[PDB]
Amino acid sequence: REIVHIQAGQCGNQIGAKFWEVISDEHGIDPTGSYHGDSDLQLERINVYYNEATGNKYVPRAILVDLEPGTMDSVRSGPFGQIFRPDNFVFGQSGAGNNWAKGHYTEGAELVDSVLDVVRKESESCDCLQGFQLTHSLGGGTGSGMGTLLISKIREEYPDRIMNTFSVMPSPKVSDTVVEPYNATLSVHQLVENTDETYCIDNEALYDICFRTLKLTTPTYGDLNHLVSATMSGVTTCLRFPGQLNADLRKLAVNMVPFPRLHFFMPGFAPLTSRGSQQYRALTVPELTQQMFDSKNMMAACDPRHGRYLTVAAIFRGRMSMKEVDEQMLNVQNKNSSYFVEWIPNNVKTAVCDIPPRGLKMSATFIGNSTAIQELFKRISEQFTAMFRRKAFLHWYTGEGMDEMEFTEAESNMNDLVSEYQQYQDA
């Protein structure tokens, strides 16, 4: 059951590259795509993310997309750039200028068919394609605008497959440009209709985790991406390794998503770790459980205590007593029953994987469909209207052919999304 991975834009390719670094290392694949590992459990489900090339080399089933060649040239020169298929690099030249309209309507349109051709070439060789995962950001132009254009076009050509995104939400604490609320609000409107599962990775939360918990005084995008590549390895554990649940992208959406629009999950990771610095005192399972439900480990700046969990999926990596895991997971549900909806029974799921991530003896990844995620969309909706009611910076978009209406519409659909999350918060 193969997955086709797509990374678009600066942020898309950087967290995209690190992801392939992390999971290649976990599966024992080298920058040359040759398997030098010590366990056949590394290979059992390697076809999900890797194609088997000639000479038994492994090539990521990955498509790299950008409207300028800068970031993708850096990936190719990066640590693992040689593992990627060179035909799967698809770049433009003029760039999208942190402009949703350029990625979605004008500059992206020239390039979008060249990408879909590479997508088709990868899907055709799949035994049984289950779906796609897109890494991108919502604040820029290429990943924000062209990414949501590919999603709409992939839905056209593969309407019965799963669309998965790791979408990086913008924050003034980590801000490239004042138009980021415009780009995100236009992308969220697309994600609501054309994705099945979206991991809301808020740069606001990644900064606070780097600054406050990790005591990094001035963190880089590489420090934030370290947190992202660890989360992405977590949420993909049951895909990449064998388990009891017979895990696929569709079953995840069936069980996580009670209503089709409310498919925006808060990721979480434990323990939280900085780069290079190693932790030697391993954790107790009570510590893993307690941290992964703690707001300080949430990758979206929302307080889950300000909402209620519709569904939760926890995945533990490492050698540990699964009876203790069950006891501890049952403990937090029973101690905090008010923060779980009572009309969805048995709405917490726990899987375990024996293989730990490089660095830690045991980890825990958290995925949550909380109604507190509205706090994130409220943030974007406020930052949006602060500019929009003066029509500020709108010339950047109308010059590319867009109308004021399309902004007003996107504003309303997101505000609707907020009120729906509030609908089920007060049940």
Partner: protein, 437 residues
């Protein structure tokens, strides 16, 4: 002799079929290559074990069984496992992508595409049957295939085999081993559609099998392999009369005659004892009165409920091992005085008993210990309706918010089929209510 065809649907059905057929082979002295030395009639026979195994001129004994999953992962293990040579591949049927925990996907979308293939492969087994009595269907309530495709298959067998009996071994869903949050939906949807097409259904609540494995086998975290090897002993107890010489429950129609006086109320409660650990070698062998007494402790039931607060409509005792009728009647008299065994006014307060002297067999290196005598009680008691209420409540909690209903409508189902199924279940609880008070 009259043949019975076993059909295993979905992961739970397939894996339990493995558990049962491995045990069936050990009981009948059949080897993983199909050879049965003790069988002198080579290439044929109307013996009782031929009710479940047909024969080839080469001396192989082949299960009258078909395995169907909408995904190859579980059945491919059968194709490569210890008993790979037992089945011919036309009996192992796989799709490419499962029903994703969705009844509507298993019944309509993927089921419609493969139902005719399965029925054709089933017809190949029926055309080796001089007199077919019916089918034994193994499935789960919770999976999309186990729930969706089974109700489709069961509707069709009523058409193609109208007069043949159909029995169910159904796995009732339990959070301790739950694969999906929508399993109450799948359970109610499948039971409603299948009810008219099933003659007798033995529900096995995974919660019961879990706790039994934990208490009596001292397994802190039981596996599917742990659960299924226990279940196969209960299934073996129920089918033994069809595979061995005996007077009780010889045809499939006797199960409904002895256990089902009312058509809708066809869910007997199975109770099995003794379950003793293989690691505990220091043991104390339980008498007839001790194991019969355990049949009325709810901890040994395949569904947790309180028979004392319900009425019985029929009660069978299936003993295996060193048992004589005198000790049985003595045990019954002792128990009758000390336990709340109320029968309905329209049925006799009797017990139908059968005894097989071959003691229960155990898988070598299993978790179950070899015992001198075992019993399986089959009681049709209204107290089992507790399981329906539990299931229907969880259904009512989610459906009030129409949670997850869109995944089902997105496959062609209508919201009204949910309400049809829940009303049927609501009637089923009332039917159990009238009989029990």
């Amino acid at each position: 002799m009259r043949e019975c065809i076993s059909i295993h649907v979905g992961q739970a059905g397939v894996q339990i079929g493995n558990a049962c057929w491995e045990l069936y082979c050990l009981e009948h002295g059949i080897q993983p290559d199909g050879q049965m030395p003790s069988d002198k009639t080579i290439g044929g026979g109307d013996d009782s074990f031929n009710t479940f195994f047909s024969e080839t001129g080469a001396g192989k004994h082949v299960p009258r069984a078909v395995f169907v999953d909408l995904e190859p992962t579980v059945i491919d293990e059968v194709r490569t496992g210890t008993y790979r040579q037992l089945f011919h591949p036309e009996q192992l049927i796989t799709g490419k992508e499962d029903a994703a925990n969705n009844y509507a996907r298993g019944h309509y979308t993927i089921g419609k595409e493969i139902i005719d293939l399965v029925l054709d492969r089933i017809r190949k087994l029926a055309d080796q049957c001089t007199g077919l009595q019916g089918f034994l269907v193994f499935h789960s309530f919770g999976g999309g295939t186990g729930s969706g495709f089974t109700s489709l298959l069961m509707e069709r067998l009523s058409v193609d085999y109208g007069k043949k009996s159909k029995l169910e071994f159904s796995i009732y869903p339990a959070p301790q081993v739950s694969t999906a949050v929508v399993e109450p939906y799948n359970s109610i949807l499948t039971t409603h559609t299948t009810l008219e097409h099933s003659d007798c259904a033995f529900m096995v609540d995974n919660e019961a099998i879990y706790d039994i494995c934990r208490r009596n086998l001292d397994i802190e975290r039981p596996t599917y392999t742990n659960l299924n090897r226990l279940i196969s002993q209960i299934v073996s107890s129920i089918t033994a009369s069809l595979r061995f010489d005996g007077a009780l429950n010889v045809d499939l129609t006797e199960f409904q005659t002895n256990l089902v006086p009312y058509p809708r109320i066809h869910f007997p409660l199975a109770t099995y004892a003794p379950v003793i650990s293989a690691e505990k070698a220091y043991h104390e062998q339980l008498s007839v009165a001790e194991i019969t007494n355990a049949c009325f402790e709810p901890a040994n039931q395949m569904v947790k409920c309180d028979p004392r607060h319900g009425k019985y409509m029929a009660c069978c005792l299936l003993y295996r091992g060193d048992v004589v009728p005198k000790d049985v009647n003595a045990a019954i008299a002792t128990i009758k005085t000390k336990r709340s065994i109320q029968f309905v006014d329209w049925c006799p307060t009797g017990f139908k008993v059968g005894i097989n002297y071959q003691p229960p067999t155990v898988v070598p290196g299993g978790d179950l210990a070899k015992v001198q005598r075992a019993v399986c009680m089959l009681s049709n008691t209204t107290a089992i309706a507790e399981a329906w209420a539990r299931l229907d409540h969880k259904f009512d909690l989610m459906y009030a918010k129409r949670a997850f209903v869109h995944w089902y409508v997105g496959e062609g189902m209508e919201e009204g089929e949910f309400s049809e199924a829940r009303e049927d279940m609501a009637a089923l609880e009332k039917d159990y209510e009238e009989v029990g008070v």
